[PDB]
Amino acid sequence: MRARLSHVTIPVLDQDSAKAFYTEKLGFEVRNDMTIGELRWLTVGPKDEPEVEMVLRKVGPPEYDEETTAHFRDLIAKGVIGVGVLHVENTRATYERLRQAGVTFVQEPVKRPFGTEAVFRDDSGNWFSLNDS
Amino acid sequence: MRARLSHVTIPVLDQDSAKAFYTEKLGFEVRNDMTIGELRWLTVGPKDEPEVEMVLRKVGPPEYDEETTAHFRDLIAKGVIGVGVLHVENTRATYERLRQAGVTFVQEPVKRPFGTEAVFRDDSGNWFSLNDSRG
């Protein structure tokens, strides 16, 4: 297998809130937003990093059933999903701009082994790390 | 924002099991395996994509409390977590090799507007799409 990861799924509570969060506050660009059938294909990514898209996926019908949407939303809002790590050239500077936009932080920037690290949440409660190596 | 996604988290039920799956069935390489306090930080990734790592994160104590652990493990076993999309040159060929390696596919390969897509599950029950660019 010669594979690459083109898309990462982010489970969201509400696709309009998440589109606004990801574009307005984080400063990602819209890659797709089209509704095919009963489903909105909404994807975003960082400026000039075209080859990974983040899929903003609704946690609710039809894709998810009653008992699963309930339990899964509840976990999302608790911050159980850590989506991954975003590498940036400067964690402290990126932190200041995100703060200014009203992003909340799980962890403020902190010195670590080989760079500065912070942890923010998205509109749904999902976590991302910021690291600058 | 100027950022690159360097790591993606995959929640797993058992890290040894996940390691074996990701390396022995998908052929990813181990990128890190070490312990940071109580937690095992275990990462894997495609041999040709050295700049992204998939973090195989134990759903269990101490990161997650017992109620959370129970609710989360249940939803993972049900296939609630779609990790993302792995792009390959030919989904049908890759489908055949993975099926022969013992990988479960909940969807066989299907032609789509972008190309051909299949869907498999990992050893925890998480799902991935396998996509190519073939009309």
Side-chain angles (χ1 to χ4, degrees), chain B residues 66-110:
Chain B
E66 253 96 328
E67 180 177 330
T68 296
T69 292
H71 276 10
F72 197 22
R73 296 186 139 255
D74 179 72
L75 281 170
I76 295 162
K78 281 167 198 185
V80 80
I81 301 301
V83 174
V85 172
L86 288 171
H87 192 278
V88 289
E89 244 280 351
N90 181 341
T91 299
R92 293 181 196 277
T94 300
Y95 175 84
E96 283 296 319
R97 92 163 127 278
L98 294 181
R99 288 287 299 135
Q100 180 280 335
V103 178
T104 293
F105 280 77
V106 295
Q107 196 202 280
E108 300 171 83
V110 170

Side-chain angles (χ1 to χ4, degrees), chain A residues 1-9 26-28 46-49 52 54 57 63-64 68 71-72 75 78 80-88 94 98 128 130, chain B residues 1-9 26 28 46 48-49 52 54 64-65 68 71-72 75 78 80-89 94 97-98 127-128 130:
Chain A
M1 200 192 201
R2 226 145 286 204
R4 67 172 181 94
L5 185 69
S6 51
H7 304 68
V8 173
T9 311
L26 291 195
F28 288 176
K47 296 164 194 160
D48 306 68
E49 185 234 31
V52 182
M54 301 171 201
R57 185 174 289 271
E63 245 205 302
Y64 296 88
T68 269
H71 281 241
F72 198 18
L75 295 168
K78 264 158 69 55
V80 166
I81 305 306
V83 178
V85 186
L86 292 167
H87 185 273
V88 294
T94 301
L98 299 175
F128 269 97
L130 237 28
Chain B
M1 183 187 292
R2 229 69 180 245
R4 197 180 47 78
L5 191 64
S6 60
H7 297 73
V8 181
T9 304
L26 308 188
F28 292 176
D48 299 311
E49 194 170 30
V52 188
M54 288 171 253
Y64 294 97
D65 69 29
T68 296
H71 276 10
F72 197 22
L75 281 170
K78 281 167 198 185
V80 80
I81 301 301
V83 174
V85 172
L86 288 171
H87 192 278
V88 289
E89 244 280 351
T94 300
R97 92 163 127 278
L98 294 181
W127 67 272
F128 271 100
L130 200 57

Side-chain angles (χ1 to χ4, degrees), chain A residues 88-107:
Chain A
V88 294
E89 186 278 320
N90 192 329
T91 293
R92 169 62 61 177
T94 301
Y95 165 84
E96 296 293 339
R97 294 184 297 257
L98 299 175
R99 279 248 83 113
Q100 196 182 118
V103 182
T104 71
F105 279 75
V106 172
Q107 176 187 295

Side-chain angles (χ1 to χ4, degrees), chain A:
Chain A
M1 200 192 201
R2 226 145 286 204
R4 67 172 181 94
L5 185 69
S6 51
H7 304 68
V8 173
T9 311
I10 303 181
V12 309
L13 299 187
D14 172 281
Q15 279 172 299
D16 294 309
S17 177
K19 186 182 193 183
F21 180 90
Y22 282 82
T23 54
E24 285 161 21
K25 296 191 177 203
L26 291 195
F28 288 176
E29 37 166 71
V30 177
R31 235 88 105 167
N32 287 269
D33 187 1
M34 65 192 303
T35 305
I36 322 308
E38 284 236 311
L39 222 73
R40 182 179 174 189
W41 189 240
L42 168 54
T43 83
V44 300
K47 296 164 194 160
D48 306 68
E49 185 234 31
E51 310 299 337
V52 182
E53 298 188 21
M54 301 171 201
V55 179
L56 313 176
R57 185 174 289 271
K58 176 146 205 213
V59 183
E63 245 205 302
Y64 296 88
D65 72 29
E66 300 294 64
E67 211 197 309
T68 269
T69 74
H71 281 241
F72 198 18
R73 289 186 139 244
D74 283 4
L75 295 168
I76 290 165
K78 264 158 69 55
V80 166
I81 305 306
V83 178
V85 186
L86 292 167
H87 185 273
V88 294
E89 186 278 320
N90 192 329
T91 293
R92 169 62 61 177
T94 301
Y95 165 84
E96 296 293 339
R97 294 184 297 257
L98 299 175
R99 279 248 83 113
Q100 196 182 118
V103 182
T104 71
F105 279 75
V106 172
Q107 176 187 295
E108 279 173 79
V110 164
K111 281 164 138 62
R112 251 67 167 113
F114 310 96
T116 291
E117 201 230 337
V119 176
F120 68 88
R121 97 186 82 240
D122 74 11
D123 62 296
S124 291
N126 304 131
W127 293 7
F128 269 97
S129 299
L130 237 28
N131 172 59
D132 72 4
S133 79

